[PDB]
């Protein structure tokens, strides 16, 4: 579970494990795929997707997911998590605002991202309905058994941990997690690399002038922009994405039927939608003479139909056609 710098972490820029990168309000189904720097899913070892492992300290905390909250302008709905990554059904929102509850603390993370949800169709809803026609939307999956893409996930760079740099009663005293690789020296001249167990520091004294580092590359990370490079190498760790964008047919929009009214080679149409509906036509002469107008306000319109025919498209309701001799 990677940890990075959340931008407006409740107060201001903290370093949250759930630091939000790559917000994708690019689908249609009320859904956003998000990456936390935290890797929830199974535990550290082997069990139960519905548990929760973020970083506390240098360490993980692979425990229950109890009170996740993604949210935006309104509280979102989770869809599924896998890896670093969560899918959640959100409404539109100027921002994105994520957070669980460990239990002692709220411990959330928030971010800017322009979000919208147009459904696919000539109706510009704000939200998916219960009914209407199905038609080919873009949307992310529920599932994990997924390989359609993979993002590079090589090592972490080092990280700071000044909990290490204690004092040896006059000298600044570094320690190690588990024998991990601590990269160490101070502004003064003393040990210059640091690949060690718990060292002391002969020369410097102040904690604030030393290299508290953790080369702990036993587990790779996501290659966040808010990661410091592991300077050594491009290690392996090509790793999939679960939530591929797929060609789901969203349960989708439908605009109320029109009121057809006859006139001489002319369609008066008293019209009354639910939401802004893009109407348009095609006078089937080799003179096309089409028309487009989003209609949200109910409006009686007109169409000079010709002899050979016109067609009529009340939103994603199917196209009509008309003989006006």
């Amino acid at each position: 579970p990677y940890i990075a710098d959340c931008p407006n972490c409740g107060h201001s820029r903290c370093d949250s494990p759930i630091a939000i990168e790559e917000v994708r309000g690019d689908a249609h189904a009320g859904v956003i795929r998000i990456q936390t720097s935290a890797m929830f899913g199974l535990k550290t070892d082997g069990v139960d997707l519905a548990y929760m492992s973020f970083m506390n300290g240098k360490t993980q905390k692979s425990i229950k997911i109890d009170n996740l909250h993604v949210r935006t302008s309104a509280p979102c709905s989770l869809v599924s998590h896998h890896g670093y990554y969560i899918l959640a059904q959100c409404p539109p929102g100027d921002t994105v605002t994520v957070g669980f509850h460990d239990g002692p603390n709220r411990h959330t993370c928030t971010v800017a991202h322009k979000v919208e949800f147009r459904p696919v169709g000539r109706e510009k809803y704000r939200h998916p309905p219960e009914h209407g026609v199905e038609l080919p939307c873009n949307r992310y999956t529920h599932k994990r058994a997924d390989q359609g893409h993979y993002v590079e996930m090589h090592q972490p760079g080092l990280v700071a941990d000044h909990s290490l740099l204690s004092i040896h009663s006059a000298k600044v005293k570094i320690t190690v997690p588990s024998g991990a690789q601590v990269k160490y020296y101070c502004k003064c001249p003393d040990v210059r690399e640091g690949i060690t167990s718990s060292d002391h520091t002969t020369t410097c004294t102040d904690v604030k002038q030393c290299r508290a580092y953790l080369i702990d590359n036993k587990k790779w990370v996501y290659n966040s922009g808010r990661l410091p490079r592991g300077e050594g190498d491009t290690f392996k760790g090509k790793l999939h994405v679960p939530f591929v964008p797929v060609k789901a047919k969203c349960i989708a929009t439908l605009a109320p039927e029109p009121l057809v009214e006859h006139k001489h080679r002319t369609l008066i149409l008293h019209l009354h939608p639910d939401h802004p509906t893009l109407l348009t036509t095609r006078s089937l002469g080799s003179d096309a003479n089409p028309t487009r107008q989003w209609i949200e306000r109910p409006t009686t319109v007109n169409f000079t139909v010709t002899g050979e025919g016109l067609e009529y498209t009340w939103g994603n309701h199917p196209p009509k056609r008309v003989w006006a001799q």
Binding site: H162, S163, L164, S166, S169, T175, S198, V207
Partner: protein, 211 residues
Amino acid sequence: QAVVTQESALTTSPGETVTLTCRSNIGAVTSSNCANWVQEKPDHFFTGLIGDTNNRRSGVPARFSGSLIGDKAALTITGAQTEDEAIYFCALWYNNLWVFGGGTKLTVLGQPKSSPSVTLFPPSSEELETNKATLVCTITDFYPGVVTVDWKVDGTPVTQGMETTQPSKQSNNKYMASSYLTLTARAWERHSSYSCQVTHEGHTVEKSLSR
């Protein structure tokens, strides 16, 4: 240029869990202070317990553990024992030097009381050949370590001439002390009944010599 502070004295009973703390005057104690805990048993006997906050020296019972609690270093004795009665000092590192705390005197219930073993010796003769006589009263193996020693020459409480050491801790953790009554070869030969009276946890023990 930093002041480590520790509890002054703590009293517990065998079997209890007791926590000693170590506070730094400059700020919270952190792992870079490498808190050390040292124990001083009687006889200027020092041993190290914990180092680098929580590393237990080898051969130090497991009932001893160190940690940081809040902003201070702490030593917990889990199942304190009678043997743990001693002075515990904490030490903190400050980038270039060590600062020791004042130490915490810890008292642990145990060691059933023990009466003193009193012996009074007469001035030896080689010493009476110096025109001097010194009656030595030795008192050992007593606990609690507090006594009252009173001398009585010929029925009369001597009040000048005596010197009584301060109770010193023996190895078994009991105490000892001796009292001296110096007379002159002559004062010696004058009076006839000497007696060293030792009062300990309410009982009295009188050891008398007869010249």
